[PDB]
Design an enzyme around this catalytic site. Structure first.
Site, PDB file in Angstrom:
ATOM      1  CG  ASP A   1      -2.099   0.958   1.090  1.00 20.21           C
ATOM      2  OD1 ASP A   1      -2.329   1.504  -0.009  1.00 20.21           O
ATOM      3  OD2 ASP A   1      -2.799   1.168   2.101  1.00 20.21           O
TER       4      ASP A   1
ATOM      5  NE  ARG B   1      -4.402   5.138   1.131  1.00 20.30           N
ATOM      6  CZ  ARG B   1      -4.275   4.970  -0.182  1.00 20.30           C
ATOM      7  NH1 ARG B   1      -4.212   6.029  -0.975  1.00 20.30           N
ATOM      8  NH2 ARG B   1      -4.174   3.752  -0.703  1.00 20.30           N
ATOM      9  CG  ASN B   2      -0.738   4.376   3.577  1.00 22.17           C
ATOM     10  OD1 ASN B   2      -1.569   4.729   4.418  1.00 22.17           O
ATOM     11  ND2 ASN B   2      -1.007   3.483   2.633  1.00 22.17           N
TER      12      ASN B   2
ATOM     13  CG  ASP C   1      -1.078   2.929   7.548  1.00 16.30           C
ATOM     14  OD1 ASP C   1      -1.226   1.799   7.036  1.00 16.30           O
ATOM     15  OD2 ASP C   1      -1.897   3.432   8.346  1.00 16.30           O
TER      16      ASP C   1
END
Length: 292
Positions: free
Chosen positions: A146, A150-151, A167
């Site tokens: 992923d 955003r991570n 994340d």
């Protein structure tokens, strides 16, 4: 439950338990569980586990702690420790005052108010930072699954900022959710089709992150839904260059998006190509668009 990384096995006992009395929450910093600024003084971010949670939520929280604690790289957020023996349970993380990369890009876009808020070199440095973290994961045979803006988090908003992968929830879920929650817009064809994952999976995702970065925080595949993207990409379709994106940078993206995984570069190669872009005056002297 045990956790294995880089050929070694760790357990809950290996986590650094910090006495609860040594931890003070200062302020909230903004799905499941909240994040706070805290002090241990050492400034930290504190991720909490809600006391109203399932046994599976507990195991997930534990596994997240084990995963982050066993990484050792400057471009992956550090874990200071945990407080699992008091409720609510805490994970203590490196405080990243710059916040998440997607929000940063959107909020720091050049505007007539801040015409020089960001330059191409700032974006190439972020790309290099995350590519370094990805290379570390790749050489240790860890598939992130992923890689997306955003991570990632930033140490600070200003010029010395360093971007880091933060994340690891997807990798955690897989290590042991639904179709609607799958990050399809970041996934290669063999991933959402056959469920086959390799390091070349993360290469594809990194290409999409690169688009996110040089678009200054746009959602990938503008105007396309998840299923539309799936059919688009599976058919050979690829995103156009972000506005004002230098050719050499866009070419890194399109190499990351080769249909066959074996045709995609590993992160050593990606780093080489990012480094070359940063040397090229015509790349770094390219002006980013000003958002009116």
């Amino acid at each position: 439950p045990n956790y294995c990384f880089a050929g070694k096995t760790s357990s809950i006992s290996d986590l650094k338990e910090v006495p609860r009395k040594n931890i003070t929450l200062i302020r909230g910093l903004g799905a499941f569980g909240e994040v706070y600024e805290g002090q241990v003084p050492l400034q930290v971010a504190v991720k909490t586990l809600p006391e109203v949670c399932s046994e599976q939520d507990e195991l997930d929280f534990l596994m997240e702690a084990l995963i982050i604690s066993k990484f050792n790289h400057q471009n992956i957020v550090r874990c200071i420790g945990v407080s699992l023996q008091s409720l609510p349970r805490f994970i203590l993380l490196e405080l990243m005052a710059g916040g998440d990369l997607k929000s940063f890009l959107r909020e720091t876009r050049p505007r007539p108010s801040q015409p020089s808020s960001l330059a191409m070199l700032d974006l190439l440095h972020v790309a290099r930072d995350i590519a370094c973290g990805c290379q570390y994961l790749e050489e240790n045979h860890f598939i992130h699954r992923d890689i997306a803006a955003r991570n990632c988090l930033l140490t600070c908003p200003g010029p010395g900022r360093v971007a880091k992968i933060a994340d690891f929830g997807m990798a955690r879920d897989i290590y042991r959710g639904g179709c609607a929650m799958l990050p399809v817009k970041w996934m290669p064809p063999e991933a959402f089709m056959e469920g086959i994952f390799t390091s070349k999976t993360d290469t594809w995702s990194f290409g999409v992150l690169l688009w996110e970065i040089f678009s200054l925080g746009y959602m990938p595949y503008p105007s396309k839904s998840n299923q539309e993207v799936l059919e688009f990409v599976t058919s050979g379709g690829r995103m156009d260059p972000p506005k004002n994106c230098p050719g050499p940078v866009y070419r890194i993206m399109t190499q990351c998006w080769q249909h066959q995984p074996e045709d995609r570069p590993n992160f050593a190669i990606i780093l080489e190509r990012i480094e070359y872009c940063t040397q090229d005056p015509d790349v770094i002297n390219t002006a980013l668009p000003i958002e009116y």
